[PDB]
Amino acid sequence: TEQEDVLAKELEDVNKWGLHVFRIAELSGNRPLTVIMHTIFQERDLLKTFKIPVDTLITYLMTLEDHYHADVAYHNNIHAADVVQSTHVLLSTPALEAVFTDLEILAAIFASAIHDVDHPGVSNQFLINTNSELALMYNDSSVLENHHLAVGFKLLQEENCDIFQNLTKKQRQSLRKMVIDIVLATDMSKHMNLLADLKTMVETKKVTSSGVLLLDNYSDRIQVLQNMVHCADLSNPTKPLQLYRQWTDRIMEEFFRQGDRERERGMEISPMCDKHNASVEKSQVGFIDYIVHPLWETWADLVHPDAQDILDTLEDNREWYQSTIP
Ligand SMILES: CCOC(=O)c1c(C)nn(-c2ccc(OC)cc2)c1C
Ligand SMILES: [Mg+2]
Numbered sequence: 001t002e003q004e005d006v007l008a009k010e011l012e013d014v015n016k017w018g019l020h021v022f023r024i025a026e027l028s029g030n031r032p033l034t035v036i037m038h039t040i041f042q043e044r045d046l047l048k049t050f051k052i053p054v055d056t057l058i059t060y061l062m063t064l065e066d067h068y069h070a071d072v073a074y075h076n077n078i079h080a081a082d083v084v085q086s087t088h089v090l091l092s093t094p095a096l097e098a099v100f101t102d103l104e105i106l107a108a109i110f111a112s113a114i115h116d117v118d119h120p121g122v123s124n125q126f127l128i129n130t131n132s133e134l135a136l137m138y139n140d141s142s143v144l145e146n147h148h149l150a151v152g153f154k155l156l157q158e159e160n161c162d163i164f165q166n167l168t169k170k171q172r173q174s175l176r177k178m179v180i181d182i183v184l185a186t187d188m189s190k191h192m193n194l195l196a197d198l199k200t201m202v203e204t205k206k207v208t209s210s211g212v213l214l215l216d217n218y219s220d221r222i223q224v225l226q227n228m229v230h231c232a233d234l235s236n237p238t239k240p241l242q243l244y245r246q247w248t249d250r251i252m253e254e255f256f257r258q259g260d261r262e263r264e265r266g267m268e269i270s271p272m273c274d275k276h277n278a279s280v281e282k283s284q285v286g287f288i289d290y291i292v293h294p295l296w297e298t299w300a301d302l303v304h305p306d307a308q309d310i311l312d313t314l315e316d317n318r319e320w321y322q323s324t325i326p
């Protein structure tokens with residue numbers, strides 16, 4: 001079919017920043033996570049390396065994708081597919097050439113795929129404030145992120161879904177630990193501390209004569225992987241403007257729905273969640289200035305000069321959003 005053909009053509013850009021992820025979601029019948037993960041696993045030769053049966057991978061991916069909510073505007077399967085593909089590009093940065101093992105690459109990609117699974121479209125603070133069952137289960141700490149991990153790992157136990165069946169016990173244990181460490185680091189409450197430690201690493205940075213990073217112990221390696229997936233999660237403002245604007249419309253819809261629930265329950269409405277007192281453009285400039293730019297500038301310093309084009313796009317988009325404010 002022409003549709004299958006156009007999908008294949010779009011997937012040829014899987015190694016590029018700015019992949020048309022929304023078009024892929026449309027052309028695949030709302031299966032961007034499955035088709036992008038499959039494409040990346042084939043590109044990196046991960047099925048052969050880890051002896052993953054192809055039918056098992058597709059079965060797991062479709063099941064995982066089914067556990068992202070189709071009625072959540074932002075934290076859905078499209079976001080998951082986007083974070084996966086963004087991580088995949090960051091792993092190919094010349095400064096990280098041959099730095100991570102195949103197991104570490106597998107961990108970072110799998111963590112990205114599951115990192116928001118079963119997201120209900122409300123924040124950790126909302127779940128805590130409403131005395132939710134999730135906040136009760138997880139003692140108010142990294143409530144969503146613990147849940148995303150539990151669901152992502154539990155789904156491996158469904159029929160023909162154990163993609164790690166042929167890993168050794170030691171490999172399985174190492175991969176599990178890494179995935180947990182990465183997904184827990186996507187909790188925004190940990191952003192300031194992650195960034196501070198990234199800055200410390202940049203200052204004491206050790207590289208070869210070609211600028212390839214030298215990371216020997218687990219502490220430094222996992223820290224770079226955590227910040228990599230965190231950067232991917234917070235990559236929307238560094239993408240081509242047309243994509244960024246669609247991501248902004250989606251998060252604003254999700255936020256406004258949370259604010260509607262807060263308003264009716266008599267709760268104070270969270271920042272950016274009040275559709276009657278919103279300033280979307282000012283919020284984007286604030287988000288870039290206080291969170292996204294500080295993070296990406298630091299990442300760019302770590303892999304200098306490989307992330308220059310990403311930082312340039314971020315600055316271009318900040319300038320555009322600022323121009324929309326009278
Ligand atoms: C266009 C997408 O970017 C956002 O506006 C955005 C996203 C995603 N997350 N947050 C965000 C919300 C709360 C928070 O505090 C926990 C940190 C970031 C913002 C502003
Ligand atoms: Mg999350």
Ligand SMILES: [Zn+2]
Pocket residue numbers: 079083115116233
């Ligand atoms: Zn996310």
